[PDB]
Amino acid sequence: RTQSYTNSFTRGVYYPDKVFRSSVLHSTQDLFLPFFSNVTWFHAIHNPALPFNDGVYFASTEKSNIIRGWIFGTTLDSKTQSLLIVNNATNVVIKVCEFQFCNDPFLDVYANNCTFEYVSQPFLMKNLREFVFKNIDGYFKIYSKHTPINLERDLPQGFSALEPLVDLPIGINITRFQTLLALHAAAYYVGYLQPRTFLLKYNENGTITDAVDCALDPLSETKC
Amino acid sequence: NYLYRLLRKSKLKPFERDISTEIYQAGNKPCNGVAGPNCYSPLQSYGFR
Amino acid sequence: TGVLTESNKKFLPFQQFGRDIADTTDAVRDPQTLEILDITPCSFGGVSV
Ligand SMILES: *[C@@H]1O[C@H](CO)[C@@H](O)[C@H](O)[C@H]1NC(C)=O
Ligand SMILES: *[C@@H]1O[C@H](CO)[C@@H](O)[C@H](O)[C@H]1NC(C)=O
Ligand SMILES: *[C@@H]1O[C@H](CO)[C@@H](O)[C@H](O)[C@H]1NC(C)=O
């Protein structure tokens, strides 16, 4: 499929902990997407596996609600409880159960042992959605945010912090991942996290409004 | 009935479980699924008496 | 030890604690009723004769 390249434009910041802080500058260290990075734009009309290199930032600027769910793991053709996520207009049922599913994941609008069966509110409802997945100490963390982009040309400027939704209690050896498609096209961005140091800014309402990447240029090192 | 893994290709991360049993090779000649020369199954019993 | 007071802090639904500059707990969320309560220390000061 077609590959393009796009500046990340200071995007992909998440809340590092579940503690309310207000009117303070806080310096944290986690696995962050670096500022002004080189993310890859994929146009799907057509599919080898994509690496999971210390975490993946995921974004989509699609209004028609076509991109639906992910699979994570190493082999992804049975043999291992890997992941499964389905997000229709009904609930958002996440499974670890493998499926032995084909290499062209199309959905029709016409398995084995099981671990996790979560049911929650619909994730997907000018609807840019950002996701961050990471794997530290056998834990799978998912952060998400919906952003009403006005001009749909590229990844927009500004700041939008990412809030956690689901913390899966187990996951082992995630190195590859894929996506799924819906047919009766798809376009998404993939960026890679990296252990950077950030200086977070909290307003009076506790909302992250600005950040400084301490290893970008010498001016930001001075600011940090 | 109690087994343990002798050796792996690399180290183990914390709270990481390994289930798949593949015949390890420590040489240039491939094992090809046969436990012959320079091919050892990693799972060996404790042998409790 | 402190004085508990009703607050107007905008806790996001995944947040249960609040922390100060010196990493002491400033606000807490009650586990039974989903309410935000500030923690302020009791009255104290110096005494000169
Ligand atoms: C991202 O990497 C590709 C790889 O060749 C490069 O062509 C492109 O210019 C890079 N984008 C930048 C540096 O903004
Ligand atoms: C905090 O939220 C209130 C409620 O909308 C808003 O009026 C106020 O401007 C916000 N404070 C900021 C943005 O600093
Ligand atoms: C615990 O108390 C809260 C507050 O009244 C109530 O909403 C909840 O149902 C109670 N839990 C149980 C298990 O009864």
Name the residue in chain A with its Cα closest to that of C9. Answer: A205
Whose atoms come closest to the Cα of A205: which ligand? 2
Name the residue type at position B7: L
- Say which experimental method was used: cryo-EM
Sign of the C-alpha dihedral computed for residues A146, A177, A32 and C11 taken in this order: positive
Q: Reduced to 3 states, what is the DSSP secondary structure of residue A219?
A: helix
What is the end-to-end Cα distance of chain A in Å, rounded?
Answer: 41
Full DSSP string of B1-49: --EEE---SS---TT--------EE-SSS--TT---TTEE-SEEE----
Q: Reduced to 3 states, what is the DSSP secondary structure of residue A142?
A: strand
Q: Which of C9, C11, C19, C25 to mutate to test the interface with A (most CBs of A within 10 A)?
A: C19
Q: What are the pocket residues of ligand 1 if the criterion is a CB atom closer than 6 Å to any ligand atom?
A: A 5, 7, 38
Rounded to whole angstroms, the Cα distance separating A136 from C6 reads 37
Phi and psi, residue A204, nearest 5°: -75, -20
Q: What are the pocket residues of ligand 2 if the criterion is a CB atom closer than 6 Å to any ligand atom?
A: A 203-205
Which value in Å is the resolution of this experimental model?
3.1
- The residues near A45 (Cβ < 8 Å, ≥ 6 apart) are A1, A2, A185
Tokens of C24: 């002491």
- The residues near A39 (Cβ < 8 Å, ≥ 6 apart) are A5, A6, A7, A8, A57, A59, A155, A189, A190, A191
Rounded to whole angstroms, the Cα distance separating A154 from A41 reads 10
Going from the C-alpha of A205 to that of each of A163, B41, C12, the distances in angstroms are: 15, 59, 10
Q: How many residues does chain A have?
A: 224
How many Å lie between the centroid of ligand 3 and the Cα of residue C32? Answer: 7
Subunits touching A (CB < 8 Å, at least 3 pairs)? B, C
Name the residue type at position A111: A
Residues in C whose CB is inside 8 Å of some CB of A read: 9-12, 14-19, 21, 27
Largest CA-CA distance found in chain A, in angstroms, rounded: 59
The residue behind tokens 């309402």 is: A205
Atom of ligand 2 nearest to the CA of A204: 14
Element (H, E) at A220: helix A218-223
Q: How far is B12 from chain A (nearest CA, A)?
A: 10
Whether residue C19 and residue A22 make contact (CB cut-off 8 A), yes or no, is no
The residue behind tokens 């910041």 is: A13
Whether residue B14 and residue A173 make contact (CB cut-off 8 A), yes or no, is no
